[PDB]
Amino acid sequence: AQNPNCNIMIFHPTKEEFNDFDKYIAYMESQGAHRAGLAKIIPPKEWKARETYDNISEILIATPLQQVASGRAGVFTQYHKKKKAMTVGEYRHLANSKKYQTPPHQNFEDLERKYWKNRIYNSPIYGADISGSLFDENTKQWNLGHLGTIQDLLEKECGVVIEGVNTPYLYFGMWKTTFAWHTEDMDLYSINYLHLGEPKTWYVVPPEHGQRLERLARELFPGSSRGCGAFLRHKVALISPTVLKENGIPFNRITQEAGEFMVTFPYGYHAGFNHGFNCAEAINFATPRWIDYGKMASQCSCGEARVTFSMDAFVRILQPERYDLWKRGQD
Ligand SMILES: O=C(O)CNC(=O)C(=O)O
Numbered sequence: 522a523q524n525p526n527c528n529i530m531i532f533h534p535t536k537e538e539f540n541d542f543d544k545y546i547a548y549m550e551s552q553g554a555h556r557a558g559l560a561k562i563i564p565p566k567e568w569k570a571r572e573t574y575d576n577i578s579e580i581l582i583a584t585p586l587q588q589v590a591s592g593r594a595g596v597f598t599q600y601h602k603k604k605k606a607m608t609v610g611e612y613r614h615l616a617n618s619k620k621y622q623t624p625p626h627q628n629f630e631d632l633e634r635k636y637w638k639n640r641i642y643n644s645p646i647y648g649a650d651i652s653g654s655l656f657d658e659n660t661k662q663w664n665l666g667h668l669g670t671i672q673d674l675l676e677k678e679c680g681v682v683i684e685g686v687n688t689p690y691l692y693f694g695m696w697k698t699t700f701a702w703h704t705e706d707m708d709l710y711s712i713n714y715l716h717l718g719e720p721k722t723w724y725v726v727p728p729e730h731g732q733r734l735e736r737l738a739r740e741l742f743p744g745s746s747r748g749c750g751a752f753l754r755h756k757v758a759l760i761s762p763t764v765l766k767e768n769g770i771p772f773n774r775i776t777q778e779a780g781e782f783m784v785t786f787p788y789g790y791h792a793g794f795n796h797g798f799n800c801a802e803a804i805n806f807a808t809p810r811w812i813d814y815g816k817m818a819s820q821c822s823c824g825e826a827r828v829t830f831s832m833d834a835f836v837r838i839l840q841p842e843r844y845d846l847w848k849r850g851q852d
């Protein structure tokens with residue numbers, strides 16, 4: 522069995538190996554990469570996403586979100602308070618202001634210590650889930666707006682044509698902006714490209730151990746768990762590495778830098794934080810191996826998680842028994 526300890530693997534494809542996305546994903550899996558839940562892919566030195574980032578300041582962040590924490594330093598939830606629209610140029614200046622800027626630090630480990638010690642005491646502002654792309658249309662390899670759609674994958678594997686579309690999203694971050702513990706919708710893959718700026722630290726639990734995380738989360742968030750059998754789908758719960766180690770949960774950590782891709786694998790729980798002002802682009806995707814995970818994915822039917830149009834068909838075709846309950850939660 523490849524990668525039996527479930528370590529995060531890092532890949533350095535050549536330009537020729539970067540031509541066929543599906544083939545390279547399947548290659549990474551042949552080496553055991555999925556067992557970690559997360560892999561890093563460093564593009565060939567010949568490749569670029571676009572020419573420059575000099576012309577992005579006029580992108581609008583229609584609904585910036587202030588991430589307000591409740592709890593204790595290592596175990597907290599966050600809610601998202603809506604703020605007035607601002608441009609990416611305005612958001613960059615905010616991120617670099619004395620109130621929000623990254624503090625002085627020694628290295629990535631010291632910054633991680635500071636994050637876990639102090640996150641709860643501040644409320645950073647996050648631009649999330651903005652439909653769009655920063656890949657040049659003439660970038661032909663690993664262009665996250667030109668991938669095969671998940672609807673076409675389900676049709677190729679199972680024969681059923683379905684409605685829906687699959688497009689990328691932009692994320693504008695600052696110091697302390699946080700992504701809560703979650704798997705992807707319908708336990709899909711994701712791919713994330715860090716276009717510019719400061720790093721992103723990731724934490725991940727191996728798919729084979731995901732239920733261990735879920736059991737800890739039910740213990741640590743007992744009211745949320747009573748509310749919804751799939752409450753991690755609400756994307757609000759944070760648990761620190763120290764707390765995970767105290768409870769014997771298997772996990773790994775890695776820091777993504779500008780110019781690097783990360784891939785999350787089906788049913789790989791992940792969480793993390795941004796080091797400072799940055800811009801990432803991400804999209805969900807599928808492969809033949811995902812279908813069996815999609816059929817088994819939990820679902821939120823309580824009303825909180827509220828998702829994309831395109832999840833309807835995936836539930837309808839892969840989970841017909843759950844469809845009626847799930848849909849009542851969406852209305
Ligand atoms: O960059 C982010 O906002 C965090 N992204 C993801 O959870 C992802 O790509 O799965």
Ligand SMILES: [Mg+2]
Nearest residue numbers: 577578579580
């Ligand atoms: Mg612009």
Ligand code: NI
Nearest residue numbers: 704705711785
């Ligand atoms: Ni994710």
Ligand SMILES: [Zn+2]
Nearest residue numbers: 749821823825
């Ligand atoms: Zn729910």
